[PDB]
Each structure stands twice: as C-alpha cells, then as structure tokens.
Amino acid sequence: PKEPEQLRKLFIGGLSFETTDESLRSHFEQWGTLTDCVVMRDPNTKRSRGFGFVTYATVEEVDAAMNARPHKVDGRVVEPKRAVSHLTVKKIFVGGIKEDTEEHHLRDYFEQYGKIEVIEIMTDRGSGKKRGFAFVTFDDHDSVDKIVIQKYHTVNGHNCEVRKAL
Ligand SMILES: CC(=O)Nc1cccc(NC(N)=O)c1
C-alpha cells in the first residue's frame, strides 16, 4: 500500500521565474521518483507564480530531498516544505509525559527527527513539581513537520500528544 499522496508532496516556494516543470523535475529527481511535478503559472500570462510542487513515490524520498537542503534550483535557493496537515515553526509541545519523564527520554526519541536545540520540561511555578508536558525546539521546521503528521508518539512508555507550539 502506497503512503497517502498528500504525505509525498513537497511545496517549493521561491522559484526562479525561469524554472519550468522540466527543470524542477530534473532537479528533484536526484532524490527519488517523481510522480508529479508542476510549476504554478498565471492562467493568462503563463508567467510563473514563483512556486510549485513535486510528488515523490515514497515518504523516504521526501525525507531524502529535505535532507539535501539547501536546494539551489536554476540559480536560486528555493524553500521546500511538506504539504499542510503552512504554520512554519521549529518548536513542539509534548503532552502526557507525566512526572517520570526526563530530558534524556525526550532527547533520545526526538533527536531522530532533527537536531535539538532546547528541551524544556515544564515544572510548577510554586512547587517545582513536573507538570507532565515539555517543549522541544529544533534547528529546522522539517523535524516538526515530520513529528506532527505521525498518528502516535511513544516516549518513556507514555502515549504522548504532540503539536506545533507558537
Ligand atoms: C529552517 C527553518 O526551519 N528556519 C526557520 C523557521 C521558522 C522561523 C525561523 N526564524 C529564525 N529567526 O530562525 C527560521
């Protein structure tokens, strides 16, 4: 069974107006099989709108393309992002971790999604007791985008609620 097409798409902003369906495809085919590749254009003038999208055959190919950023396409650094499920943030809320979850539990799990810059385990302002939630800040938004599309996150035995923060 194929992964849903929405999860295989990359929206590419910041295109050179000279980028075409063919040149966008030639570039992004370096990281996987493209089932679709389109530059958005004005319906009357045919002038590029400066963005487009590519669809890979698999999610692992999307990952490969994102891991190969920055992408310079036809002389311009472009801005690839996964399809919306865009609220482009580098921080997540992690809820449901209870009182026994520590920094290393969160680091060991989340470091496989991206490079972590900050882990903040929330504690009660009055007592110092753990409140059962945390924030994790990454160096890049794609980590967050991969995280929030998963149905489940299991950390320290807890089934966690994870959402984009701020
Ligand atoms: C690669 C990536 O996610 N960059 C990004 C995303 C959101 C905000 C900012 N802002 C900033 N000053 O760093 C940067």
From Swiss-Prot:
Q: Which GO terms describe its cellular component?
A: catalytic step 2 spliceosome; cytoplasm; cytosol; extracellular exosome; membrane; nucleoplasm; nucleus; ribonucleoprotein complex
Residues in RRM domain copies: 8-85, 90-166
Q: Where is this region: Globular B domain?
A: 86-166
Q: Which domain of life is it from?
A: Eukaryota
**Cross-link Glycyl lysine isopeptide (Lys-Gly) (interchain with G-Cter in SUMO): which residues?**
98
Q: Where is this cross-link: Glycyl lysine isopeptide (Lys-Gly) (interchain with G-Cter in SUMO2)?
A: 2, 72, 164
Instruction: Explain the post-translational modification.
Output: Sumoylated.
BP-aspect Gene Ontology terms = alternative mRNA splicing, via spliceosome; cellular response to glucose starvation; cellular response to sodium arsenite; import into nucleus; mRNA splicing, via spliceosome; mRNA transport; negative regulation of telomere maintenance via telomerase; nuclear export
Q: Where is this region: Globular A domain?
A: 1-85
The reply on keyword Acetylation is yes
> In this chain, where does the modification Phosphoserine occur?
16
Recall the GO molecular function terms of this protein's record: DNA binding; G-rich strand telomeric DNA binding; identical protein binding; miRNA binding; pre-mRNA binding; protein domain specific binding; RNA binding; single-stranded DNA binding
Keywords for this protein: Acetylation, Amyotrophic lateral sclerosis, Cytoplasm, Disease variant, Host-virus interaction, Isopeptide bond, Methylation, mRNA processing, mRNA splicing, mRNA transport, Neurodegeneration, Nucleus, Phosphoprotein, Repeat, Ribonucleoprotein, RNA-binding, Spliceosome, Transport, Ubl conjugation
Location in the cell: Nucleus; Cytoplasm
Q: What's the disease link here?
A: Inclusion body myopathy with early-onset Paget disease with or without frontotemporal dementia 3: An autosomal dominant disease characterized by disabling muscle weakness clinically resembling to limb girdle muscular dystrophy, osteolytic bone lesions consistent with Paget disease, and premature frontotemporal dementia. Clinical features show incomplete penetrance.
Q: What does this protein do?
A: Involved in the packaging of pre-mRNA into hnRNP particles, transport of poly(A) mRNA from the nucleus to the cytoplasm and modulation of splice site selection. Plays a role in the splicing of pyruvate kinase PKM by binding repressively to sequences flanking PKM exon 9, inhibiting exon 9 inclusion and resulting in exon 10 inclusion and production of the PKM M2 isoform. Binds to the IRES and thereby inhibits the translation of the apoptosis protease activating factor APAF1. May bind to specific miRNA hairpins.
User: How does the annotation summarize its subunit structure?
Assistant: Identified in the spliceosome C complex. Identified in a IGF2BP1-dependent mRNP granule complex containing untranslated mRNAs. Interacts with SEPT6. Interacts with C9orf72. Interacts with KHDRBS1. Interacts with UBQLN2. Interacts with PPIA/CYPA. Interacts (via the RGG-box) with the HOXB-AS3 peptide; the interaction inhibits binding of HNRNPA1 to the intronic sequences flanking exon 9 of the PKM gene, preventing inclusion of exon 9 and promoting inclusion of exon 10 which suppresses formation of the PKM M2 isoform and promotes production of the M1 isoform.
Q: What is the recorded name of this protein?
A: Heterogeneous nuclear ribonucleoprotein A1
- Supply the source organism for this entry: Homo sapiens
Q: Which residues of the full protein are shown?
A: 7 to 181 of 372
